[PDB]
Amino acid sequence: ADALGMIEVRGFVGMVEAADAMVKAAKVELIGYEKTGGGYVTAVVRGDVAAVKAATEAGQRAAERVGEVVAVHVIPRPHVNVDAALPLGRTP
């Protein structure tokens, strides 16, 4: 449906400063956070591609001052099998 934005930080503190700087920078929807174990947490924001591209680049710009930022990526179109299989806030 909507576009997709992700910051993955080894550490909970850097993910929150990521997840705080994203929802201030644009009109996005912080839907949750995925705990894959081992200290990795992934903030998932969601909205149109104008917002979540200019939000996660402000998420990465703030989370590189407190945490070891693992991976930053924007998916403008998650495919319809992705949103039904992976927990990305749009489970039908």
């Binding site: 201030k24 920078a25 644009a26 009109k27 591609v49 104008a50 917002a51 200019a54 939000a55 402000a58």
Partner: protein, 202 residues
């Protein structure tokens, strides 16, 4: 000659309120994305404004023809529209993102516990929120004058302060802020950290 190109990703409420109070144009509402362009000479900004308006859906508020400089502010809800207007403005000038002047923080001060005798002068010479006596004060000058709105935006976005005055047009960009001690110190740290991360020509 490009002097200031800054893109405000989202207008904070007191910044949008001050721009609506002191703008000669179509006023912004909070939550909108904004874009500031300042060039010299101060009459080619009409050509810059016309290029941006024929390209995109954006809507101008602050177009000030100064003594020698020229400032432009366009804004819209869609950040893609605002960045497309920025692409059009930078294509009309035939420059790039980093042709702008690097901002110079000239004098930043925190003037904690302002006595009332000074507050009456400051609030008589300001359009934004009033300063109460016994509160901290954060004054700020940047050259060029366009980056003072970036400083005010990030300073409101980080901590909870009162916006007293911001001067986007002129030879030097002035910014007043008021509030308690810790909140002014956090907003001062935010404004100083936000101005110094602007790449351009020194």
């Amino acid at each position: 000659t490009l002097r200031t190109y800054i893109f405000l990703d989202a207008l904070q409420p007191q910044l949008a309120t001050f721009i609506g109070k002191t703008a000669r144009g179509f006023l912004p509402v909070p939550g909108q994305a904004s874009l500031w362009v300042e060039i010299a000479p101060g009459i080619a900004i009409n050509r810059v404004t016309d290029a941006a308006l024929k390209a995109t859906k954006v809507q101008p508020a602050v177009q000030v023809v100064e003594r020698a400089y020229g400032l432009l502010e366009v804004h819209h809800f869609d950040q893609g529209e605002v960045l497309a207007a920025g692409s059009t403005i930078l294509d009309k000038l035939e420059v790039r993102e980093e042709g702008r002047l690097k901002p110079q923080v000239m004098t930043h001060q925190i003037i904690r516990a302002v006595e009332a005798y000074q507050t009456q002068i400051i609030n008589r010479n300001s359009q934004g929120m009033m300063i109460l006596p016994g509160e901290s004060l954060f004054i700020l000058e940047t050259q060029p004058a366009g980056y003072a709105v970036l400083a005010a935006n990030e300073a409101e976005k980080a901590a909870n302060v009162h916006l007293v005055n911001v001067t986007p047009y002129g030879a030097f960009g002035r910014l007043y802020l008021a509030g308690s001690e810790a909140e002014i110190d956090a907003a001062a740290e935010a404004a100083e950290a936000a101005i110094r991360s602007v790449s351009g020509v020194a």
